[PDB]
């Protein structure tokens, strides 16, 4: 995800959790050179990322 630079890992985890009604195991964030914050949100093992990507519309 691309997230607000203000947000931290706790906020990103909490936002993703009940925006998409899933559980999150880990959040890894970086700030890319264009100033945006990119979050790698690893879901719980029971949740499937491909399934969630379909419901979101990513693919």
């Amino acid at each position: 995800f691309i997230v607000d630079v203000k947000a931290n890992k706790h906020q990103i985890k909490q936002a993703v959790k009940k925006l998409y009604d899933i559980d999150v195991a880990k959040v890894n964030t970086l700030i890319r050179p264009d100033g945006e914050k990119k979050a790698y949100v690893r879901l719980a093992p029971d949740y499937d990322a491909l399934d969630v990507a379909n419901k979101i519309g990513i693919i």
Binding site: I31, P33, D34, G35
Partner: protein, 50 residues
């Protein structure tokens, strides 16, 4: 350097985003005189000075 403050990194972010050519459709607009971005910075020619 790889070591950088958040303020310097955010400053370098704005300078990269600005260093792009004009959209080609800008030229078609009425009363247009901008034929090319005159504020283009090349990393090796002109330095930011920070």
């Amino acid at each position: 350097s790889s070591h950088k403050t958040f303020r310097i990194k955010r400053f370098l972010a704005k300078k990269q985003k600005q260093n792009r050519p004009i959209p080609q459709w800008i030229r078609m607009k009425t009363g247009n005189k901008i034929r090319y971005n005159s504020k283009r910075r090349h990393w090796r020619r002109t330095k930011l000075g920070l």
